Amino acid sequence: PGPPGPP
Amino acid sequence: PPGPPGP
Amino acid sequence: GPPGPPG
Numbered sequence: 631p632g633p634p635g636p637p
Numbered sequence: 638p639p640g641p642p643g644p
Numbered sequence: 645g646p647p648g649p650p651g
Contacts, residue, residue, distance in 0.1 A: 635650045636650055636651070640647050
């Protein structure tokens with residue numbers, strides 16, 4: 631999986 | 638796959 | 645994978 635999105 | 642929704 | 649969506 632990719633990284634989380636930003637806030 | 639895409640990363641998760643951000644904070 | 646790509647970054648997730650913005651939170």
